[PDB]
């Protein structure tokens, strides 16, 4: 009945938002953001797996970013792994901490980059909006097969709305501070 698609609609949604958060994690703002490296493909001596399984992705300041590691025979091995990976980060081999700098918001970055997140935001909305479409298609469907009451439909067609609405609030307000990381 409605029950096991009210909860079904719900999981599909608040796991829709937790992809957005996840794909505005692979952008480069001014700020340090260690979760930038903490999702990078990297080889080392046998198998893939990110650098999570090797170094601490720490910080030095808002505009720089220390890489505390254990083992000092792969410093060039990862350096290239990082310095060829669609980011544009030249790591200094100052020794010890693979210094990766954070070059500033160049304004053609405060913008156009910003345009990307609030676009990526929008498509995350669309996915949610479409969980909506389905969720109550099931509702509407199990009505014209007399298993619901008009009332029970109506109170289920809304509330699905309540799920969309709130779920958007999460998308929108996770984007909104992420916009502060440049504005």
């Amino acid at each position: 009945m409605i029950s096991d698609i009210r909860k079904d609609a719900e999981v599909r949604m608040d796991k829709c938002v937790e992809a957005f958060k996840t794909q505005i994690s692979k952008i480069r703002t001014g700020r340090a953001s260690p979760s930038l490296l903490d999702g990078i493909v990297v080889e080392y001596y046998g198998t893939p797996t990110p650098l999570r399984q090797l170094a601490s992705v720490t910080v030095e300041d808002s505009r720089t970013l220390k890489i505390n590691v254990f083992d000092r025979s792969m410093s060039p091995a990862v350096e290239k792994a990082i310095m060829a990976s669609d980011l544009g980060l030249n790591p200094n081999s100052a020794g010890s901490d693979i210094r990766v700098p954070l070059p500033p918001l160049t304004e053609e970055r405060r913008k156009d980059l910003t345009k990307i997140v609030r676009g990526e935001a929008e498509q995350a909305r669309v996915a949610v909006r479409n969980v909506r479409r389905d969720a109550n298609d099931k509702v509407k469907a199990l009505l014209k097969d007399k298993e619901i009451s008009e009332d029970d439909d109506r109170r289920s067609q809304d509330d699905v709305q309540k799920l969309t609405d709130a779920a958007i609030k999460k998308i929108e307000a996770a984007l909104a501070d992420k916009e502060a990381e440049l504005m």
Binding site: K80, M83, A84, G88, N90, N92, P101, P103, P104, T106
Partner: protein, 123 residues
């Protein structure tokens, strides 16, 4: 063909192919690194080849190779750009000069280091 044709439409001559719009035909232009890529070379060769996209002086956004073992530069960087080309990676048409106004020269060069802007050890 006819002399009477040549007289009427005289002999054409190919013009400048120019393989390097460093606008005013200049020996080099100054520019800022838009970004600092790494891309892979053309067919028979395989590497991580270091490179940067560079707005310069005159409005042209271009893209230049940064050679030698081990360079150091980022966004902020203003480089000096000179006519160049790399046979691998066809995008290119330009080389960054090492030891011009920001990028620096190669660490620990001795052979052919005019070409990588490196002061002498201690002669």
């Amino acid at each position: 063909a006819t002399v009477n044709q040549l007289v009427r439409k005289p002999r054409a001559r190919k013009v400048a192919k120019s393989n390097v719009p460093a606008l005013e035909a200049c020996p080099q232009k100054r520019g800022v690194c838009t970004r600092v890529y790494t891309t892979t070379p053309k067919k028979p060769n395989s590497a991580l080849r270091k490179v940067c996209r560079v707005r310069l002086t005159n409005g042209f956004e271009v893209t230049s190779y940064i050679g030698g073992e081990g360079h150091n530069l980022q966004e902020h960087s203003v480089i000096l750009i000179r006519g160049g080309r790399v046979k691998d990676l066809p995008g290119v048409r330009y080389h960054t000069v090492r030891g011009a106004l920001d990028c620096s020269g190669v660490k620990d060069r001795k052979q052919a280091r005019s070409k990588y802007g490196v002061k002498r050890p201690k002669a």
